[PDB]
Enzyme design. Structure first.
Site, short mmCIF file in Angstrom:
data_model
loop_
_atom_site.label_atom_id
_atom_site.label_comp_id
_atom_site.label_asym_id
_atom_site.label_seq_id
_atom_site.Cartn_x
_atom_site.Cartn_y
_atom_site.Cartn_z
N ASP A 305 20.31 89.11 46.53
CA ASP A 305 21.08 90.30 46.11
C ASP A 305 22.57 90.10 46.25
O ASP A 305 23.32 90.61 45.41
CB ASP A 305 20.65 91.53 46.92
CG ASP A 305 19.31 92.10 46.49
OD1 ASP A 305 19.08 92.22 45.28
OD2 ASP A 305 18.55 92.52 47.38
N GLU A 308 23.68 87.56 43.42
CA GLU A 308 23.31 87.92 42.04
C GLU A 308 23.82 89.29 41.62
O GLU A 308 23.93 89.53 40.42
CB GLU A 308 21.80 87.78 41.82
CG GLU A 308 21.34 86.34 42.03
CD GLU A 308 19.91 86.13 41.63
OE1 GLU A 308 19.00 86.69 42.29
OE2 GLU A 308 19.64 85.42 40.64
N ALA A 388 20.43 98.27 45.74
CA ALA A 388 20.01 97.26 44.81
C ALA A 388 18.86 97.85 43.99
O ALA A 388 17.67 97.63 44.30
CB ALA A 388 19.59 96.01 45.61
N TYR A 391 16.03 99.57 46.25
CA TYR A 391 16.21 99.54 47.69
C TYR A 391 17.61 99.93 48.11
O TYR A 391 18.62 99.70 47.40
CB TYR A 391 15.93 98.12 48.22
CG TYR A 391 14.51 97.88 48.61
CD1 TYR A 391 13.83 96.76 48.14
CD2 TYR A 391 13.86 98.76 49.46
CE1 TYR A 391 12.54 96.50 48.55
CE2 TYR A 391 12.56 98.51 49.88
CZ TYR A 391 11.91 97.36 49.45
OH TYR A 391 10.64 97.13 49.89
CO LIG Z 1 10.58 95.78 51.61
#
Ligand SMILES: [Co+2]
Ligand SMILES: [Co+2]
Lengths: 666, 664
Positions: A305, A308, A388, A391
């Site tokens: 994350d 990217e 993200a 999440y």
């Molecule tokens: Co998880």
């Protein structure tokens, strides 16, 4: 001067004026070419130059911007440096075979593209959604990660597709079965991965979580609880001067960038007038979130994350007293958009101090604890929260009054979900968390990057393992079999450092200065990494996950310092196959370089392994991760003893308040 | 003539019940000189309690357990008093055990050593004049175990220190020798004297009060600006006697001399369906083994719960110092040696605290305008106890996702022994101050869980993360990323004897194999998530490993039977560790069934401590934690009906402010 003002401090992030000065410089250098901006960020001073400037009256380091651009009709990217004082490009090169971080603008375009693509519309119809209901189709735009059908030859996203019956739904109860592949720069779908087994959209109700949904689902909300109110009527104890923090003898610079998010620099502790360095730089430098279903195309779920998408680019505006409770100091973040204009995220970083329970206590039994001293602890927290897609990652850098520094993470937000047929088994690779919903197994792994300067320059690292004495029970040396010690393995070369957490020895790692000696214990001053949330990398050697995240297969990696060794999966992460000598694989090299008593970089892999359960759905309760760096042999005594106690009564005070004599209590 | 019955069968004995019990025992043993060691609730049998609570069953008898000594008789006597009838209903003599050391037992020892001629002579040899014995102190320890005496005398060992002034912290100035004291005769019977004498340190004491710090570093820091916590509308928890209700949890808060806090009858109200979780949870024993092999330091391995008692040692917390905010306190009551009740005021603190975020999610499509945030509150039930030098701060924490965690903070003072000027402390200890050796040690704890996950009939398992066994490049694992959780259900006791393993990120489930989550298809469980799980470093066959049979595995699961509380046996001091008692008895041959039955789960956790100067002269708090998390217990996040701190839907954000993303 036409140039931007210099910053208060060489590590300050680029201002909005500096960002625009840099992008005007780059557009003029590439005049006549159609370019777009991917990254415009501080190029931090060289370590040597910074320390010479800060501590040795040395040269002012040049103020530099690093940029990454695309050019219409050209493959890959160009990158380079702008010298801000002279408004000039001083370094530039073309990298035709990499792809760069996906910005918010890059991602925000994808849902439009898939809603209007004829092949996607046909797949929606086959999946049970009429063609005139494409406004109910959503996707989370991911990087493709890596797909061996295209390499880096096109810039690609994959769209994880979902359905909402109403715009206020949480879509994750209703994944679709297919995965469009989108050319980011052409704004076109180029392929759709379609499973062999089709699963049409779920007919169940969405699994929702706002109050209006909960009232329908469970009948009523709980009543508002009585409040807990926090106030600091005489203000706070910390002092900020621009981005420089002073609190409880710590001093450090709070920086921020598009990729790492918070970067803490130039960290020292004022030990009774002796200002002692601890760390030159500490931050999160990369992540990987590898999923554990082998079925196609789920191998492409292993987002890195930070490299990217960027923990800065993804960061939430925190205001106000919801995310961060109490009396708060905020910092803003500034980036470039594709046009080269500055953009701002307000309230990107929250800084505050909080009660943290007891710092220390002791009482004497002899007068039934009338002799007692109690001192309460306060902690300083420097925090951000980033999203993200599904999440949320809540990051808390915590300073404490015993000199320790901790990183606490809370994971929340929503599970990644894929569709599950009526009679399909989710296990062993995932969990049925709601009807027709498969939440696949995954890890969340992080690469903490420490550039240490423990009590000054010239440092080493070691593994510390608790071991029983090798002498047997009943020997003269170990008569009762109780002896035990700490075995310290100092790493001499890079290869020695490549080590995992071991429960069998309660392993910790020291970062220490072998040039100095604690006058009491005789051991070098150190900060000890105490960290047990250290999963093995479950993907196998030679997997796409292990190749793209070379750092993740050891809990600790220590390499020589060189400038610009920030990002351990390489500078341009999306669509790298993991083949090649770059990032941590380059820095490890043949494993032979010295790391004892030199400038080192310590990269620690930590995180969790997540087997979803229904409690995590439709919205996940926070799950904690933590690691600590503790002074050990750094000080000569507990450094907090000059903090005024909350309560203190001596033996002579307690006596006044009321052959050889025994205990008062006898 | 009997005491009033309590509000609840698990309430601790009241002061009236304690005195009724000791009057009953003194009358039973009339004409004999006895002293009281323990007078405490004998909790109802598990079946009897559950039948009473849930099935309209019989009221369990209200019973007191006692332990007494009799002058001139070896060992102890123990038994039960039926309080309603003021009668002794069970009694026996145990001539070859020694019982827990009470505060009174220990309070006496420093007088004994100050006045003993042989101790005075050793002080003089150590550099302290004979007329300065008021400057000599000792921490009274159980002898632990010494093969020269077994259980044939009741013994303490005195760890001796020196204060130049009574306000000093004595631990910078240990002496080199170790008196052995007969507790009941109040006499020194032996003194262990080292081959290498080391006289008392001539250095200044390493002190820590503000007056000392002003002298040492020049000034205290100025008082920091305050952080004030208020709850102007009161608290959200409700107590009815010792029964707590908070955030759908309901449980009984008990307390005793030995375990300290005991949490019982723990349920969660799942939208009107009151679901059991645990019948009982507490700390049941500890061991703090030191790692110097040199004599007599093998005798430093205190089992603090069984040898001193986390209730007996507990501090009065009064204070908005120990417990900050709006607090509910409980008192503790015990017996003294005369059989009179004693009270520790404010032994338990109960309060609620903010605990950061419970959950959050925002939608990137409208740059996070669609957002929901809910803050967490935790409930904390706490005590702090002092074991001579050390402080153990215990916090039982209930959270709004249904998890239960135990947090410990270690503070207080390192155990220290003298170090000669030219003596190396390593590898077994650290020189933390001149002439001061702080020996290596572990702190290990035995958490005892009597589960009732979603009702009766439970099992336990180890859960290990594992890569797929299929290789990279196979049809089954083409890209090598597949992984799963391998669940090993324990069938017999021997299967359960398991350690934490970092290589698999091991957790343990406690689950109900009779039930199934309707979404996941898995049984309801609480998962133990615990990584502070040291190996026992002492060798097999060592004193330490024999006296703490539970400590050599992270998990031990045995069948339930009544009165299986204390895993190093009922009377711990001076047991050699030989014999079938405690956890060794409950394990037996390892063959008994523990799948789908009434089980007890004993978890060993703690830390390995290599001292450093930061720990001295007073140690900053060091944390230990473990959690028990619902997994497959609920069908969704149980906290979603808590009012958010902030919530804005997509339609609300649009009002406030094919097409693509709003942010496109
Ligand atoms: Co998880
Ligand atoms: Co310790």
């Amino acid at each position: 001067s036409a140039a931007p003002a210099r910053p208060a401090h060489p590590l300050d992030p680029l201002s909005t004026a500096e960002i625009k000065a840099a992008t005007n410089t780059v557009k003029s250098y590439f005049a006549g070419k159609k370019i777009s901006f991917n990254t415009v960020t501080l190029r931090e001073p060289a370590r040597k130059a910074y320390i010479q400037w800060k501590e040795q009256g040395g040269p002012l380091p040049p103020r530099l911007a690093y940029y990454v651009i695309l050019e219409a009709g050209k493959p890959g990217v160009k990158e380079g440096l702008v010298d801000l004082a002279s408004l000039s490009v001083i370094e530039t090169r073309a990298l035709e075979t990499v792809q760069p971080i996906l910005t918010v603008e890059d991602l925000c375009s994808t849902e439009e593209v898939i809603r209007n693509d004829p092949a996607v519309i046909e797949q929606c119809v086959l999946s049970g959604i009429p063609a005139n209901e494409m406004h109910k189709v959503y996707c989370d735009p991911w990087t493709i990660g890596y797909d061996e059908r295209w390499g880096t030859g096109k810039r690609l996203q994959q769209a994880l597709v979902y359905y909402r019956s109403d715009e206020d739904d949480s879509q994750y109860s209703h994944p679709l079965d297919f995965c469009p592949i989108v050319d980011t720069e052409e704004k076109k779908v180029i392929f759709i991965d379609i499973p062999n087994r089709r699963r049409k959209v779920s007919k169940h109700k969405h699994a929702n979580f706002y109050p209006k949904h909960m009232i329908e689902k469970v009948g009523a909300m709980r009543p508002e609880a009585p409040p807990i109110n926090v106030t600091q009527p005489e203000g706070v104890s910390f002092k900020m001067t621009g981005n420089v923090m002073e609190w409880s003898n710590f001093k450090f610079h709070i920086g921020f960038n598009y990729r790492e998010g918070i970067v803490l620099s130039d960290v020292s502790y004022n030990d009774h007038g002796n200002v002692r360095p601890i760390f030159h730089r500490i931050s999160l430098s990369e992540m990987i979130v590898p999923y554990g279903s082998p079925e196609f195309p789920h191998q492409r779920k292993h987002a890195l994350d930070i490299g990217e998408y960027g923990a800065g680019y993804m960061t939430n505006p925190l205001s106000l007293g919801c995310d961060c409770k109490g009396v708060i100091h905020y910092l803003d973040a500034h980036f470039s958009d594709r046009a080269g204009d500055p953009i701002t995220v307000k309230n990107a970083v929250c800084i505050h101090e909080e009660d943290d329970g007891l710092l220390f206590k002791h009482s004497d039994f002899r007068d039934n604890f009338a002799t007692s001293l109690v001192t309460r602890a306060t902690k300083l927290v420097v925090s951000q929260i980033f999203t993200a897609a599904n999440y949320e990652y809540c990051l808390y850098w915590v300073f404490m009054q015993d000199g320790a520094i901790r990183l606490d993470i809370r994971l929340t937000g929503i599970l990644n979900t894929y569709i599950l047929g009526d009679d399909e088994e989710a296990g062993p690779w995932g969990t049925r968390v709601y009807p027709n919903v498969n939440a696949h197994n995954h890890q969340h792994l992080f690469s903490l990057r420490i550039d240490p300067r423990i009590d000054g320059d010239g440092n080493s690292a070691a593994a510390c393992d608790a071991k029983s004495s090798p002498y047997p029970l009943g020997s003269p040396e170990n008569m009762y079999g109780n002896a035990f010690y700490s075995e310290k393995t100092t790493f001499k070369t890079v290869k020695d450092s490549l080590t995992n957490y071991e429960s069998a020895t309660g392993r910790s790692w020291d970062i220490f200065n072998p040039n100095k000696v604690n006058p009491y214990s005789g051991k070098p001053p150190s900060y000890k990494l105490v960290s047990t949330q250290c999963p093995p990398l479950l993907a196998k050697e030679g997997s796409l996950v292990a190749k793209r995240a070379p750092w993740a297969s050891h809990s600790v990696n220590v390499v020589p310092y060189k400038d610009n060794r920030l990002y351990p999966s390489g500078d341009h992460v999306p669509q790298w196959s993991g083949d090649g000598v770059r990032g941590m694989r380059e820095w490890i090299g043949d494993g032979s370089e010295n790391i004892d008593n030199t400038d080192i970089l310590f990269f620690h892999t930590f995180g969790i392994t997540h087997f979803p359960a229904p409690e995590d759905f439709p919205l996940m309760p926070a799950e904690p991760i933590t690691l600590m760096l503790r002074p050990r042999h750094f000080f000569t005594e507990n450094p907090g003893l000059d903090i005024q106690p909350s309560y203190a009564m001596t033996t002579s005070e307690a006596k006044r308040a009321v052959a050889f004599e025994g205990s008062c209590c006898g």
